[PDB]
Structure 1
Amino acid sequence: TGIIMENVTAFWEEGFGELLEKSFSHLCLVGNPVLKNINLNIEKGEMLAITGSTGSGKTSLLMLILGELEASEGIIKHSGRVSFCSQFSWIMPGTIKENIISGVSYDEYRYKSVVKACQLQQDITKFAEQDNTVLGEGGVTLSGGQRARISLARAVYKDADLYLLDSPFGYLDVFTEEQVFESCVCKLMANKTRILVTSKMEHLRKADKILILHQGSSYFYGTFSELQSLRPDFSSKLMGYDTFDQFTEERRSSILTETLRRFS
């Protein structure tokens, strides 16, 4: 399914802040806009890369689609099931397999396809019981990347029309992340409409459409090509690094924020 948003604006509402964590009263009382004048038209099977300064409304735009935040003005169109992969990688009690499948029908081919694509084979091969290894609530002894890949495999394995992947790529095993983005987001999901919140420039370059947010506002919307010519200042600075995508998640967002605060 495709997804369209025409001149959308969403204001803070009670509770939304609580959900966001998983003050706010003032933002609600003041009728502050969490997202203002957002426009985007994503065709079926396309990939939308969302980035921007820290705390710019990336996760909120997602909640907007999940319907957890209402659109005070504007039109938002999209239909079908939507699968959501939150920034917080959760792990319920049970095996690695059980965690990837949860409440979905088991299809061996579908399953092994997703595990392989998410680069989980390199992990489970390390355990005596492989993907039948038992995890505890939170998968505490696993690495941040391992937890994200399983969390990501769960969202991906779910059959949906629209996938919302919030920042799955932000940990130290940066090389594995590059493989995962190529194999899973780019190949196995090539025909699935998908939105990826990211702070890696490669992802903007491979995307079909790009949305850069700053202060809940749309700093830029278009193709990676349109970005270089219509925002050379921003473009030049971020492309100016040799290996920006290998900096830590925090440095990338820091450079992104400062660049955004600078060029209006």
Structure 2
Amino acid sequence: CVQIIGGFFTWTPDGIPTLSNITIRIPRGQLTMIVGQVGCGKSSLLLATLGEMQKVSGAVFWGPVAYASQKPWLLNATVEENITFESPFNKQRYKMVIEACSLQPDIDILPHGDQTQIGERGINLSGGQRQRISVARALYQQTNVVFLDDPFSALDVHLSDHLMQAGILELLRDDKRTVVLVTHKLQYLPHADWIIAMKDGTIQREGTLKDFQRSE
């Protein structure tokens, strides 16, 4: 599991802290949503769980962890390359990830059916395509933990439903990975195990769905 006790850090060598008194357990094989308002330390907590931000006074334990950031990024290479990301290619695995991301038709829409040279930052692609490619990169890698920083911001309702069904609840939940996804929707609340509510950089309440509905 991913254990955190006494969260405390900020974005400076000295200054007022934004991370304050966070204690969270992320057990294996469990969907964990993080919900809250705009500016409640969701992605900050994501990067702190990563070890990206060495906290001032606190303990954090859990490694190579797959992670798709909020702002999508690409390489100066092909689509297959960005989705493989220096990994030995697979037939069934890669085709599964391609189909489960609702990406094969739009991939075939491009001027080059595949191995198309993705431009610098993705000028000849749209935001939703970049996001789907990032989510495919995150899902395709073989690892224990996956983070997805709101992968449903530039997607429709149909594509988001198909992604959360085929790629998340059927493919991620298949191999029993520790999926930690942060977003704000309705369909995903009853599909997770632990609900995490954040307010002003503090965990307001914590627990499961029933422990959240039986509390204030």
How high is the TM-score relative to the length of structure 2?
0.91
AA of the residue aligned to 1:41: R
2:207 corresponds to 1:198: no
TM superposition shift of 1:122? 3.0
93, 105, 108: which one aligns with 1:125: 108
Q: CA RMSD in A?
A: 1.7
- Following the alignment from structure 1 to structure 2, what is the Cα–Cα distance between the partners of residues 172 and 45? 26
Residue 44 of structure 1 aligns to a residue in which SS? coil
Q: Does structure 2 retain, via aligned residues, the 8 Å contact 1:47–1:193?
A: yes
AA of the residue aligned to 1:8: G
AA of the residue aligned to 1:81: P
- Residue of structure 2 in register with 1:6 after alignment: 5
Unaligned runs of 5+ in 2: none
Are the structure 2 counterparts of residues 92 and 75 from structure 1 closer, same or farther at C-alpha, using a change threshold of 3 Å?
same
2:198 corresponds to 1:213: yes
Are the structure 2 counterparts of residues 209 and 71 from structure 1 closer, same or farther at C-alpha, using a change threshold of 3 Å?
same
Q: Does structure 2 retain, via aligned residues, the 8 Å contact 1:33–1:216?
A: no
2:150 corresponds to 1:167: yes
How high is the TM-score relative to the length of structure 1?
0.75
Q: Does structure 2 retain, via aligned residues, the 8 Å contact 1:47–1:194?
A: yes
- Residue of structure 2 in register with 1:246 after alignment: none
Deviations 1:19-63 (A, max 9, x none): xxxxxxxxx33xx22221112212111111112111111111111
Unaligned runs of 5+ in 1: 15-27, 232-264
Are the structure 2 counterparts of residues 217 and 102 from structure 1 closer, same or farther at C-alpha, using a change threshold of 3 Å?
same
Residue 187 of structure 1 aligns to a residue in which SS? helix
Residue 226 of structure 1 aligns to a residue in which SS? helix
- Residue of structure 2 in register with 1:55 after alignment: 39
Higher relative contact order (CA 8 A, sep 6+): 2
AA of the residue aligned to 1:149: R
- Residue of structure 2 in register with 1:239 after alignment: none
Tell me the percent identity: 36
Deviations 1:54-112 (A, max 9, x none): 1111111111122121122232121x321110001112122211111122222222211
- Following the alignment from structure 1 to structure 2, what is the Cα–Cα distance between the partners of residues 225 and 130? 48
Q: Does structure 2 retain, via aligned residues, the 8 Å contact 1:10–1:33?
A: yes
TM superposition shift of 1:207? 0.8
- Residue of structure 2 in register with 1:137 after alignment: 120
TM superposition shift of 1:141? 3.0
TM superposition shift of 1:172? 4.6
Query: In terms of mean alpha carbon deviation, does 133-142 or 45-54 score higher?
Result: 133-142
Q: Does structure 2 retain, via aligned residues, the 8 Å contact 1:145–1:173?
A: no
Deviations 1:90-148 (A, max 9, x none): 12122211111122222222211211121212322323533322210211232221110
Aligned length: 214
* 4+ residue runs over 4 A deviation: none
92, 97, 100: which one aligns with 1:109: 92
Question: Which is helix-richer, 1 or 2?
Answer: 1
Are the structure 2 counterparts of residues 122 and 222 from structure 1 closer, same or farther at C-alpha, using a change threshold of 3 Å?
farther
- Residue of structure 2 in register with 1:258 after alignment: none
Residue 136 of structure 1 aligns to a residue in which SS? coil
- Following the alignment from structure 2 to structure 1, what is the Cα–Cα distance between the partners of residues 186 and 208? 13
AA of the residue aligned to 1:135: I
Residue 202 of structure 1 aligns to a residue in which SS? coil
